[PDB]
Structure formats: C-alpha cells, structure tokens
Design a protein around this ligand. Sequence first.
Ligand code: HEM
Ligand SMILES: *[C@@H]1O[C@H](CO)[C@@H](O)[C@H](O)[C@H]1NC(C)=O
Ligand SMILES: *[C@@H]1O[C@H](CO)[C@@H](O)[C@H](O)[C@H]1NC(C)=O
Ligand SMILES: *[C@@H]1O[C@H](CO)[C@@H](O)[C@H](O)[C@H]1NC(C)=O
Ligand SMILES: *[C@@H]1O[C@H](CO)[C@@H](O)[C@H](O)[C@H]1NC(C)=O
Ligand SMILES: *[C@@H]1O[C@H](CO)[C@@H](O)[C@H](O)[C@H]1NC(C)=O
Ligand SMILES: c1ccc2ccccc2c1
Ligand SMILES: [Cl-]
Ligand SMILES: [Mg+2]
Length: 325
Amino acid sequence: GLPPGPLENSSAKLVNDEAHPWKPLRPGDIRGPCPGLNTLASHGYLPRNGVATPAQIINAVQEGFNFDNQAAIFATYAAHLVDGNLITDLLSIGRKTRLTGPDPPPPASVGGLNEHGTFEGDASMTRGDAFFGNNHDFNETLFEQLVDYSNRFGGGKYNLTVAGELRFKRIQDSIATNPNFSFVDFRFFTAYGETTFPANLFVDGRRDDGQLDMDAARSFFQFSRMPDDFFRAPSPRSGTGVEVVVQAHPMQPGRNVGKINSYTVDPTSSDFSTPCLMYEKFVNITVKSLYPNPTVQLRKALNTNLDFLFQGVAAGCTQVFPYGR
Ligand code: HEM
Ligand SMILES: *[C@@H]1O[C@H](CO)[C@@H](O)[C@H](O)[C@H]1NC(C)=O
Ligand SMILES: *[C@@H]1O[C@H](CO)[C@@H](O)[C@H](O)[C@H]1NC(C)=O
Ligand SMILES: *[C@@H]1O[C@H](CO)[C@@H](O)[C@H](O)[C@H]1NC(C)=O
Ligand SMILES: *[C@@H]1O[C@H](CO)[C@@H](O)[C@H](O)[C@H]1NC(C)=O
Ligand SMILES: *[C@@H]1O[C@H](CO)[C@@H](O)[C@H](O)[C@H]1NC(C)=O
Ligand SMILES: c1ccc2ccccc2c1
Ligand SMILES: [Cl-]
Ligand SMILES: [Mg+2]
C-alpha cells in the first residue's frame, strides 16, 4: 500500500483511551528493541502480536505518538527493506518469525528488528549490545544508569542534557568492553536521534516540556505501557534537539577493530556533514548486498519500497537506483 500522509489533526489528545488499552503479552506476541513500536503494539495501535505492514507502522507512530510523517516514512521503509518481507509486506518489530511468510533467498535474512547490524545496533540506552548476548530485551542495569544520569544531569528527569551525557557514556562503555563495537553509517545517525525520542515523544503532550519522569520512562521502556491518561505530543516531531546531544560530546563514526579500546575512525562512513551519503550507502551497499540479484517479483517490490524510502529523505538528495528505473 501507499505510505500514509501526515495527520489531518495533529493536536495533543488522549491516546491511552478505551479503544487502545494496554494488554499483557500472549504466547507468540513479539516485542523488540524499540520502546515506541512495542508500546503501540501493546496498546493495539499495531497488531498486538508485533507483526505489521509498513502502512500500519506509519499510521501507528503518527496516531499514537505524533511522530512526524517524513521521519516515519524513512525509518519504516528502511527497517522494512533490511528486516521485513518485501513480498508479503510484513515486518516483525522483534525476533525473526515465520509469521512474515516465505523467506527470500539469502543473503537476505528477514530477521525482524532484532537483526543486529541492519537497523538495530550498538550503544543503545536500555538494551545491551548484541555481542553481550541480547540486543532487544529491556535491561534493568542499563535503565538504572539512565535513572542515575537523569538524577545527575536532569534534576531527576530525562531531558536533552541527560541524553547528551548518556549517549556518550554508552559509546565509551561499548568501546571499553565490546571488541566488535560498530558505530558507523546508519547506526551513527539513529543512535543520536533515538536519544531525543523519550524527551520529545514520551512526555505527556499537555506539558511537552522535554522533561520525562522516571515512572513514565520505566512504563514505556520496560512495560511498553503508556501512563494512565497519557496525551500524545501536541504537534508532529521526531528528533528535534539532536544538535544538543551531539554538541555535548561530538564523535566521529568508527568501530573497534576486534579488540577493546581500539576505536578506529572510518573515513568511508557518512557523518552529520554528509546526510545524503548515509542514504546512498544504505541503498547501494546495505539493501543491495541483501538482494544482489533479485528475481522478478522481488525486484519490483524492492523498487516500490525504495521509492517510498526516498519520500522520507530530506530534500536536497538525489535518488539512487540499484535495480534501474
Ligand atoms: C517509525 C518507525 C520506527 C521504527 C522502524 C523504529 C525502529 C527502532 C529500532 C530498530 C530501534 C533499535 C535501535 C537500537 O537501539 O539498537 C529503535 C530504538 C528506539 N526507538 Fe524506535 N522505531 C520507530 C519509531 C519510534 C517512535 C515513534 C518512538 C517513540 C515514540 C521510538 C523510540 C525509540 C527509542 C527511545 C529507542 C531507543 C531504545 C534504547 O536505546 O534503549 N521509536 N527503534
Ligand atoms: C482536533 O482534535 C482535537 C483533540 O482531539 C479537537 O479538540 C479539535 O477540535 C480538532 N480539530 C478539528 C479541526 O476538528
Ligand atoms: C560484529 O560486527 C559486524 C559488523 O562490523 C557484524 O556483521 C556482526 O553481526 C557483529 N556481531 C555482534 C555479535 O556484534
Ligand atoms: C544488562 O546490562 C548489564 C550491564 O551492561 C550486563 O552486565 C548484563 O549482563 C545485562 N543483562 C542482564 C540480564 O542483566
Ligand atoms: C535538564 O534538566 C536540568 C535540571 O533541571 C537543567 O539544568 C537542564 O537545563 C535541562 N536541559 C534541558 C535541555 O531541558
Ligand atoms: C550509488 O549508486 C549510484 C548508481 O546507481 C551512483 O550514482 C552513486 O554515486 C552511488 N553512491 C554511492 C555512495 O556509492
Ligand atoms: C530509530 C528509529 C526511528 C527513527 C526515525 C527517524 C530518525 C531516526 C530513527 C532512529
Ligand atoms: Cl508530519
Ligand atoms: Mg541496539
């Protein structure tokens, strides 16, 4: 289906309402590394089993949290291209599942959002790096560190100042302990933007003050649960204030090189000075490597989803065509 358009009415409103109650997981229900999508699934904005179409995801993030349309489109189609089934039009928000349908040939994995190194990556705030055994479940120790950083830099609340400090701490801890730490290209971008999301989108929209309390933070991050009487944000947004996070501790893209404490800058990586390069590499390298010589129906589905992806790219970039026009 076509990517949904922006909300017709983007005002703050109660989104923890009678039609969207929180419910606990049933056997088989999938949750993954994204507390936003997890919460939407657990309130029935998405299918409660955690398997959805790109159109369902875009509608849910807009309706439930007032995520902006351009950001919704880019993130959703990027995730779907690398982790979803392009023939069935289904994506798991967590683990790989037979529910997304018959798989394409390798090297495409259709591994859901839990797939390491496609969309998901290292130095997440409340999830551990994949090297340490689990890149998707809520981690209490990491959450308590978020609480500590909120106490130290946010007066007990999570805000952009806290984000700036915690983002850097998680990078430096991965450098020190994960010999396979990777922090380039698509992950380098998403790792920064995601740290703004709790301040921009988990804060009740009647306040919209960028100060997230720890009871609400735990409810979303651990339980995929909106606070009682939760109002969504009062206007469309995603990553506003990411400049504050970057400015706190500016980093270059790079990786550890098979050993701890060996962070080596990658000059081939995109960075914030080259946002169109991030898009071009994502298509030409990441997507193309998963689908190097697709058959007829796959090629068509790739091109459709790549056209939708490009709708989410900030104006100024040139579309690239790995499988022709
Ligand atoms: C629009 C479609 C979306 C997709 C496809 C998506 C996907 C993802 C993925 C794969 C991750 C894991 C990255 C990582 O930390 O390794 C992630 C993290 C995150 N997502 Fe989303 N997401 C979307 C929308 C949202 C929305 C609307 C919110 C908030 C309302 C949100 C909040 C977050 C947060 C806070 C994290 C970081 C978790 C952490 O580091 O502990 N996301 N998302
Ligand atoms: C938009 O929705 C809000 C909150 O649900 C409502 O109060 C407002 O009147 C709506 N705007 C229009 C033009 O209907
Ligand atoms: C190690 O890093 C590479 C990317 O540099 C990635 O393909 C691989 O999945 C990583 N594995 C883990 C467990 O981090
Ligand atoms: C959570 O994160 C901590 C700190 O990185 C790690 O030591 C621990 O093994 C992780 N998992 C659990 C289940 O606590
Ligand atoms: C975060 O909270 C602390 C303490 O209230 C404050 O000094 C700082 O200015 C806040 N930052 C933002 C971006 O709101
Ligand atoms: C991506 O491939 C296109 C050709 O389809 C080429 O023009 C473009 O320069 C490539 N970009 C990168 C970053 O490789
Ligand atoms: C993770 C998930 C969703 C996103 C949307 C826009 C930009 C970066 C993101 C990173
Ligand atoms: Cl929008
Ligand atoms: Mg991660």
